[PDB]
């Protein structure tokens, strides 16, 4: 797992039980100085054999010699507008706003495609007590308003 | 779909009238009359009482560019019985069997009879009341000049 240790080795040499010329020591399993292309991977527990694929969040990965070789899969993205004022963007990034207007939440860049609005106005007493009130969708070349 | 009890329904689902969209709009001004306007140039008027009737209006830009049981709209009426595979038919029921929208419909034929000879009790009622279109004491003689 920790390969290439000897490039940062600030110790002199002594006696003890070691490995041969190649044949790195098995850390993840329990055996001895196994060859490098028999290193079992691991992923929160399970001892994956070298060649067992797995389907993760947005990528699929295969256990190569000790390391994972991962390849991307298509997965969507979700913007959320929760509470009165808690925006979570498509890329993480949660923030608090407390507005009073119509605001452009998402719109297509080309010339037309769509535009999603949303009213974030005060609902309580002060200005810091805001609420979502109206969602407006401008679709089908911006000629249909929902 | 315009059923014969009102009941306008879009994609097998009831709609509420009026229903104005980007490409067409459906109105209902008088509860026995439906008015449909399209942006292409097509206008419909569906009558619902006493019997169901239909009136279709096209612009003169669509002249020589339609096919159906309404002809082709080119100025001549000798070629309205021209089928979609060549030649002009002779009778109305021979032309119109080429415009069936379902393949499992039977073929219909003309009827060289008049109904006022087959029914002696209906033919005096028909003579007394339809003659009001021709006599000038009624409020139908105002239209006799046009
Ligand atoms: Ca014609």
UniProtKB/Swiss-Prot annotation, chain A:
Changing residue 14 to V: Decreased binding to Cu(1+) without affecting binding to Cu(2+). Abolished binding to Cu(1+). Changing residue 10 to A: Decreased binding to Cu(2+). Coiled coil: none annotated. Colon, small intestine, colonic tumors, bronchus, cervix and gall bladder. Coats the epithelia of the intestines and other mucus membrane-containing organs to provide a protective, lubricating barrier against particles and infectious agents at mucosal surfaces. Major constituent of the colon mucus, which is mainly formed by large polymeric networks of MUC2 secreted by goblet cells that cover the exposed surfaces of intestine. MUC2 networks form hydrogels that guard the underlying epithelium from pathogens and other hazardous matter entering from the outside world, while permitting nutrient absorption and gas exchange. Glycans are attached at residue 111. Ca(2+) 2 binds at residue 91. O-glycosylated. O-glycosylation is required for mucin assembly. Goblet cells synthesize two forms of mucin that differ in branched chain O-glycosylation and the site of production in the colon. This is Mucin-2. It comes from the Eukaryota. Residues 1-39 form the TIL domain. Homomultimer; disulfide-linked. The N- and C-terminus mediate their assembly into higher order structures to form filaments. The CTCK domains of two polypeptides associate in the endoplasmic reticulum to generate intermolecularly disulfide-bonded dimers. These dimers progress to the Golgi apparatus, which is a more acidic environment than the endoplasmic reticulum. Under acidic conditions, the N-termini form non-covalent intermolecular interactions that juxtapose assemblies of the third VWD domain (VWD3) from different CTCK-linked dimers.
From Swiss-Prot, chain B:
It comes from the Eukaryota. Residues 1-106 form the VWFD domain. O-glycosylated. O-glycosylation is required for mucin assembly. Goblet cells synthesize two forms of mucin that differ in branched chain O-glycosylation and the site of production in the colon. Colon, small intestine, colonic tumors, bronchus, cervix and gall bladder. Coiled coil: none annotated. Transmembrane segments: none annotated. Ca(2+) 2 binds at residues 72, 74, 76, 79-80. It is found in: Secreted. The CTCK domain mediates interchain disulfide bonds with another molecule of MUC2. Coats the epithelia of the intestines and other mucus membrane-containing organs to provide a protective, lubricating barrier against particles and infectious agents at mucosal surfaces. Major constituent of the colon mucus, which is mainly formed by large polymeric networks of MUC2 secreted by goblet cells that cover the exposed surfaces of intestine. MUC2 networks form hydrogels that guard the underlying epithelium from pathogens and other hazardous matter entering from the outside world, while permitting nutrient absorption and gas exchange. Homomultimer; disulfide-linked. The N- and C-terminus mediate their assembly into higher order structures to form filaments. The CTCK domains of two polypeptides associate in the endoplasmic reticulum to generate intermolecularly disulfide-bonded dimers. These dimers progress to the Golgi apparatus, which is a more acidic environment than the endoplasmic reticulum. Under acidic conditions, the N-termini form non-covalent intermolecular interactions that juxtapose assemblies of the third VWD domain (VWD3) from different CTCK-linked dimers. This is Mucin-2. The chain holds residues 459 to 604 of 5289 of the full protein.
